[PDB]
Amino acid sequence: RLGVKRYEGQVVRAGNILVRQRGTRFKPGKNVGMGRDFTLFALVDGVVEFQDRGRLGRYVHVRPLA
Amino acid sequence: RLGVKRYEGQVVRAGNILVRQRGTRFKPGKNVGMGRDFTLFALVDGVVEFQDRGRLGRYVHVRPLA
Amino acid sequence: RLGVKRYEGQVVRAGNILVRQRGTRFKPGKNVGMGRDFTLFALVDGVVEFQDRGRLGRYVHVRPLA
Amino acid sequence: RLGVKRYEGQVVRAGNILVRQRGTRFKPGKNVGMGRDFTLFALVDGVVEFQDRGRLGRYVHVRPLA
């Protein structure tokens, strides 16, 4: 279905889906890509991190393991 | 480590961890996701709500933010 | 007719029928396949185990033995 | 992918895949054929039946419909 697929601090890998959405509820952050279907995926292995920039929207980042 | 990470009525945002468990000690409720490691996380922003259903399991819900 | 066909912890063999359902009353878990008729069967030889994932559904698994 | 595809007593048609295996995890029983890719399949229309001969191996048979 749609919705968030990862939790704060969860370890992920390249290609890994992070969020499914018809729109841009969540914006691509550092190390995060976005297909045409608005899906958000990890560009590298790391840790999922959510951040709310308020007016700028809700972004999703991936912090490289090392 | 393992254990509940939120309290009754706490205010959580999408992706926040609610419970870290080895098994299905707590069940995913409304607006609550669960990873392969059985981690329960908030699918949307809201209020944490614990519901004991007895033998039917103990649910963890996320009531849509007001 | 329809209904659960095995009990918790029952030892079963590959091919064995586990549950006969019209829909996804139960979902196939580890080592459990699901036919077109939604019938759940053991993919391997092992012990039957039931698991409730709440908002995510109730699964049926087969724990290999030895 | 790999794995047993039918459940005990399931009705299959001629040419239906019964099992997918890399080796001879299961031997071709009555009315059952095996492709070069060890894939078992029903030679006729009938009912799937598993037979565990232990040390002799494991055969998959298809009992003629009628």
Tab-separated table of C-alpha atoms in Angstrom:
chain	number	residue	atom	x	y	z
A	1	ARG	CA	0.000	0.000	0.000
A	2	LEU	CA	1.057	3.623	0.417
A	3	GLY	CA	2.609	5.332	3.414
A	4	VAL	CA	5.932	5.394	5.240
A	5	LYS	CA	7.883	2.128	5.092
A	6	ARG	CA	10.830	2.941	7.348
A	7	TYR	CA	11.260	4.208	10.875
A	8	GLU	CA	13.638	6.771	12.374
A	9	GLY	CA	17.141	5.357	12.623
A	10	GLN	CA	16.330	2.175	10.715
A	11	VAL	CA	19.272	0.833	8.705
A	12	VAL	CA	18.689	0.665	4.949
A	13	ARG	CA	20.474	-0.048	1.673
A	14	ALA	CA	20.718	1.412	-1.828
A	15	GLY	CA	17.452	1.115	-3.731
A	16	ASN	CA	15.468	0.521	-0.539
A	17	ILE	CA	11.999	2.080	-0.601
A	18	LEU	CA	11.357	4.572	2.199
A	19	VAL	CA	7.960	6.057	1.401
A	20	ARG	CA	5.146	5.428	-1.094
A	21	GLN	CA	3.019	8.406	-2.150
A	22	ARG	CA	0.912	9.750	-5.029
A	23	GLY	CA	2.230	13.224	-4.263
A	24	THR	CA	5.149	14.865	-2.479
A	25	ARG	CA	4.005	14.564	1.149
A	26	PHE	CA	7.630	13.738	1.893
A	27	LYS	CA	10.418	15.428	-0.048
A	28	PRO	CA	13.697	13.721	-1.090
A	29	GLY	CA	16.520	14.536	1.296
A	30	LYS	CA	20.240	13.806	1.430
A	31	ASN	CA	21.112	10.454	-0.154
A	32	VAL	CA	17.471	9.976	-1.174
A	33	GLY	CA	16.032	9.657	-4.657
A	34	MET	CA	12.515	9.904	-6.044
A	35	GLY	CA	11.042	8.067	-9.002
A	36	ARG	CA	8.217	9.284	-11.229
A	37	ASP	CA	5.746	7.511	-8.942
A	38	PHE	CA	6.957	9.803	-6.138
A	39	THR	CA	8.413	6.857	-4.250
A	40	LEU	CA	11.353	7.727	-2.028
A	41	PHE	CA	14.348	5.410	-2.032
A	42	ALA	CA	17.784	5.203	-0.437
A	43	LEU	CA	20.658	6.216	-2.690
A	44	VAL	CA	23.199	4.649	-0.315
A	45	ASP	CA	23.436	2.310	2.658
A	46	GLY	CA	22.706	4.159	5.862
A	47	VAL	CA	20.202	5.178	8.510
A	48	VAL	CA	16.752	6.621	7.791
A	49	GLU	CA	16.134	10.048	9.306
A	50	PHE	CA	12.978	12.188	9.205
A	51	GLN	CA	13.077	15.968	9.562
A	52	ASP	CA	10.311	18.563	9.436
A	53	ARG	CA	11.371	21.909	7.980
A	54	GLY	CA	7.878	23.254	8.566
A	55	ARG	CA	7.081	25.687	5.756
A	56	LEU	CA	9.566	23.919	3.460
A	57	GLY	CA	7.869	20.578	4.053
A	58	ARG	CA	8.753	17.166	5.450
A	59	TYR	CA	12.009	15.700	4.146
A	60	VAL	CA	13.582	12.257	4.485
A	61	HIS	CA	17.342	11.707	4.646
A	62	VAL	CA	19.732	8.770	4.754
A	63	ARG	CA	22.940	9.064	6.762
A	64	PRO	CA	25.733	6.845	5.356
A	65	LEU	CA	26.767	4.089	7.782
A	66	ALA	CA	30.365	5.301	7.488
B	1	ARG	CA	17.481	-1.652	22.859
B	2	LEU	CA	14.137	-3.405	23.331
B	3	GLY	CA	11.103	-1.924	25.056
B	4	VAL	CA	8.352	0.676	24.745
B	5	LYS	CA	9.658	4.057	23.558
B	6	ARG	CA	6.499	6.125	24.104
B	7	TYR	CA	3.925	6.873	26.792
B	8	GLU	CA	0.119	6.990	26.671
B	9	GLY	CA	-0.965	10.126	24.852
B	10	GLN	CA	2.535	11.147	23.766
B	11	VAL	CA	2.773	13.192	20.569
B	12	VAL	CA	4.634	11.471	17.766
B	13	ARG	CA	5.497	12.339	14.166
B	14	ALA	CA	5.551	10.031	11.140
B	15	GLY	CA	8.374	7.516	11.391
B	16	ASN	CA	8.846	7.726	15.148
B	17	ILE	CA	9.528	4.461	16.980
B	18	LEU	CA	6.872	3.407	19.471
B	19	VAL	CA	8.089	-0.041	20.528
B	20	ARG	CA	11.275	-2.040	19.931
B	21	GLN	CA	10.575	-5.762	20.246
B	22	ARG	CA	11.952	-9.184	19.272
B	23	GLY	CA	8.513	-10.567	18.470
B	24	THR	CA	4.901	-9.396	18.228
B	25	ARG	CA	4.744	-8.479	21.932
B	26	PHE	CA	2.744	-5.406	20.847
B	27	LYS	CA	0.542	-5.346	17.739
B	28	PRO	CA	0.483	-2.664	15.046
B	29	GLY	CA	-2.635	-0.545	15.451
B	30	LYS	CA	-4.158	2.334	13.522
B	31	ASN	CA	-1.515	4.477	11.815
B	32	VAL	CA	1.170	2.169	13.155
B	33	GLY	CA	3.669	0.372	10.986
B	34	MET	CA	5.928	-2.539	11.853
B	35	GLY	CA	9.313	-3.438	10.401
B	36	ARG	CA	10.699	-6.919	9.768
B	37	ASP	CA	12.477	-6.705	13.119
B	38	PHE	CA	9.029	-6.068	14.624
B	39	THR	CA	9.689	-2.393	15.369
B	40	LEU	CA	6.453	-0.434	15.682
B	41	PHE	CA	6.557	3.036	14.136
B	42	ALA	CA	4.119	5.894	13.515
B	43	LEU	CA	2.788	6.005	9.956
B	44	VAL	CA	1.389	9.508	10.508
B	45	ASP	CA	1.777	12.321	13.040
B	46	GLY	CA	-0.360	11.943	16.141
B	47	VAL	CA	-0.971	10.695	19.674
B	48	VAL	CA	0.227	7.352	21.000
B	49	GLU	CA	-2.569	5.233	22.446
B	50	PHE	CA	-2.131	1.809	24.069
B	51	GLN	CA	-5.054	-0.629	23.970
B	52	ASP	CA	-5.070	-3.906	25.872
B	53	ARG	CA	-7.329	-6.449	24.176
B	54	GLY	CA	-6.416	-9.312	26.496
B	55	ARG	CA	-5.737	-12.611	24.718
B	56	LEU	CA	-6.320	-10.759	21.449
B	57	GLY	CA	-3.065	-8.888	22.017
B	58	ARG	CA	-1.969	-5.422	23.127
B	59	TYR	CA	-2.405	-2.793	20.417
B	60	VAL	CA	-0.483	0.433	19.929
B	61	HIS	CA	-2.388	3.094	17.985
B	62	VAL	CA	-1.480	6.532	16.667
B	63	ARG	CA	-4.481	8.861	16.813
B	64	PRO	CA	-4.353	11.477	14.002
B	65	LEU	CA	-2.978	14.760	15.323
B	66	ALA	CA	-5.644	17.358	16.107
C	1	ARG	CA	-15.117	-27.459	4.040
C	2	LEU	CA	-13.342	-24.251	5.051
C	3	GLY	CA	-11.522	-23.604	8.316
C	4	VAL	CA	-8.189	-24.095	10.044
C	5	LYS	CA	-6.798	-27.573	9.427
C	6	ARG	CA	-3.808	-27.677	11.779
C	7	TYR	CA	-3.218	-26.821	15.420
C	8	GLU	CA	-0.489	-24.639	16.919
C	9	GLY	CA	2.782	-26.546	17.033
C	10	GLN	CA	1.504	-29.409	14.908
C	11	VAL	CA	4.166	-31.237	12.906
C	12	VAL	CA	3.445	-31.138	9.168
C	13	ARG	CA	5.004	-32.118	5.837
C	14	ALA	CA	5.630	-30.311	2.549
C	15	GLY	CA	2.407	-30.013	0.597
C	16	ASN	CA	0.166	-30.412	3.648
C	17	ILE	CA	-2.945	-28.215	3.794
C	18	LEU	CA	-2.907	-25.702	6.655
C	19	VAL	CA	-5.985	-23.520	6.115
C	20	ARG	CA	-8.897	-23.469	3.647
C	21	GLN	CA	-10.269	-19.980	3.104
C	22	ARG	CA	-12.273	-17.873	0.655
C	23	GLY	CA	-9.905	-14.955	1.063
C	24	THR	CA	-6.885	-13.879	3.074
C	25	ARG	CA	-8.360	-14.792	6.473
C	26	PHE	CA	-4.841	-15.895	7.303
C	27	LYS	CA	-1.717	-14.955	5.392
C	28	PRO	CA	1.072	-17.309	4.303
C	29	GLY	CA	4.218	-16.880	6.388
C	30	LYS	CA	7.638	-18.525	6.383
C	31	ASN	CA	7.593	-21.816	4.491
C	32	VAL	CA	3.899	-21.415	3.729
C	33	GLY	CA	2.600	-21.087	0.196
C	34	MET	CA	-0.854	-19.981	-0.881
C	35	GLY	CA	-2.741	-21.523	-3.774
C	36	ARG	CA	-5.104	-19.718	-6.124
C	37	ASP	CA	-8.015	-20.779	-3.904
C	38	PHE	CA	-6.291	-19.019	-0.988
C	39	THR	CA	-5.495	-22.401	0.479
C	40	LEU	CA	-2.454	-22.260	2.724
C	41	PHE	CA	-0.035	-25.175	2.636
C	42	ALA	CA	3.347	-26.121	4.075
C	43	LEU	CA	6.189	-25.465	1.662
C	44	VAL	CA	8.497	-27.419	3.928
C	45	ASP	CA	8.437	-30.095	6.614
C	46	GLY	CA	8.076	-28.583	10.066
C	47	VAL	CA	5.959	-27.288	12.914
C	48	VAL	CA	2.916	-25.051	12.461
C	49	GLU	CA	2.891	-21.686	14.195
C	50	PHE	CA	0.263	-18.917	14.305
C	51	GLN	CA	1.165	-15.217	14.507
C	52	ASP	CA	-1.081	-12.162	14.924
C	53	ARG	CA	0.351	-8.919	13.530
C	54	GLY	CA	-2.714	-6.846	14.362
C	55	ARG	CA	-3.493	-4.158	11.792
C	56	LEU	CA	-1.197	-6.189	9.512
C	57	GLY	CA	-3.064	-9.488	9.712
C	58	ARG	CA	-2.768	-12.968	11.198
C	59	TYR	CA	-0.083	-15.148	9.620
C	60	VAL	CA	0.614	-18.865	9.576
C	61	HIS	CA	4.212	-20.108	9.523
C	62	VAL	CA	6.007	-23.439	9.405
C	63	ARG	CA	9.125	-23.702	11.554
C	64	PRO	CA	11.545	-26.225	10.055
C	65	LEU	CA	12.707	-28.869	12.511
C	66	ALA	CA	16.101	-30.049	13.800
D	1	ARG	CA	10.830	-19.051	-7.755
D	2	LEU	CA	11.905	-22.322	-6.126
D	3	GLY	CA	9.518	-24.232	-3.878
D	4	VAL	CA	6.551	-26.595	-3.841
D	5	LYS	CA	3.660	-25.043	-5.765
D	6	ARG	CA	0.683	-27.292	-4.990
D	7	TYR	CA	-0.951	-28.584	-1.828
D	8	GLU	CA	-1.880	-32.168	-0.987
D	9	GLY	CA	-4.975	-33.169	-2.924
D	10	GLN	CA	-5.142	-30.077	-5.117
D	11	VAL	CA	-6.710	-30.479	-8.570
D	12	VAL	CA	-4.273	-29.711	-11.373
D	13	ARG	CA	-4.371	-29.643	-15.171
D	14	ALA	CA	-1.971	-31.259	-17.646
D	15	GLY	CA	1.205	-29.209	-17.857
D	16	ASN	CA	0.847	-27.511	-14.491
D	17	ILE	CA	3.981	-26.832	-12.461
D	18	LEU	CA	3.985	-28.982	-9.335
D	19	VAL	CA	7.393	-28.073	-7.920
D	20	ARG	CA	10.405	-25.923	-8.762
D	21	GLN	CA	13.784	-27.267	-7.672
D	22	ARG	CA	17.485	-26.931	-8.492
D	23	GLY	CA	18.061	-30.607	-7.882
D	24	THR	CA	15.853	-33.631	-7.400
D	25	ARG	CA	14.418	-32.525	-4.059
D	26	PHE	CA	11.296	-34.369	-5.257
D	27	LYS	CA	11.179	-37.269	-7.717
D	28	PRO	CA	8.549	-37.480	-10.484
D	29	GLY	CA	5.748	-39.716	-9.239
D	30	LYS	CA	2.872	-41.188	-11.243
D	31	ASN	CA	1.592	-38.941	-14.050
D	32	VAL	CA	4.331	-36.477	-13.154
D	33	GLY	CA	7.047	-35.330	-15.503
D	34	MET	CA	10.327	-33.555	-14.865
D	35	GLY	CA	11.924	-31.036	-17.196
D	36	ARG	CA	15.686	-30.712	-17.555
D	37	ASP	CA	15.469	-27.914	-14.988
D	38	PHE	CA	14.184	-30.508	-12.515
D	39	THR	CA	10.825	-28.750	-12.659
D	40	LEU	CA	8.046	-31.217	-11.932
D	41	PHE	CA	4.770	-30.957	-13.841
D	42	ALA	CA	1.461	-32.805	-14.203
D	43	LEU	CA	1.244	-35.050	-17.267
D	44	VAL	CA	-2.534	-35.345	-16.993
D	45	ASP	CA	-5.493	-33.691	-15.293
D	46	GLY	CA	-5.907	-34.863	-11.723
D	47	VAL	CA	-5.120	-34.572	-8.030
D	48	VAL	CA	-1.728	-33.856	-6.454
D	49	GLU	CA	-0.471	-36.355	-3.899
D	50	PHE	CA	2.766	-36.237	-1.926
D	51	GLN	CA	4.487	-39.423	-0.803
D	52	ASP	CA	7.393	-39.438	1.607
D	53	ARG	CA	9.519	-42.542	1.129
D	54	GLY	CA	12.137	-41.152	3.493
D	55	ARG	CA	15.473	-42.672	2.492
D	56	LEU	CA	13.944	-43.551	-0.900
D	57	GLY	CA	13.290	-39.847	-1.398
D	58	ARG	CA	10.119	-37.840	-1.957
D	59	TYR	CA	7.761	-38.355	-4.886
D	60	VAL	CA	4.931	-36.199	-6.210
D	61	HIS	CA	2.044	-38.034	-7.890
D	62	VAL	CA	-1.022	-36.871	-9.806
D	63	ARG	CA	-3.924	-39.297	-9.495
D	64	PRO	CA	-6.064	-39.344	-12.681
D	65	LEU	CA	-9.210	-37.309	-12.237
D	66	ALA	CA	-11.653	-40.064	-13.155
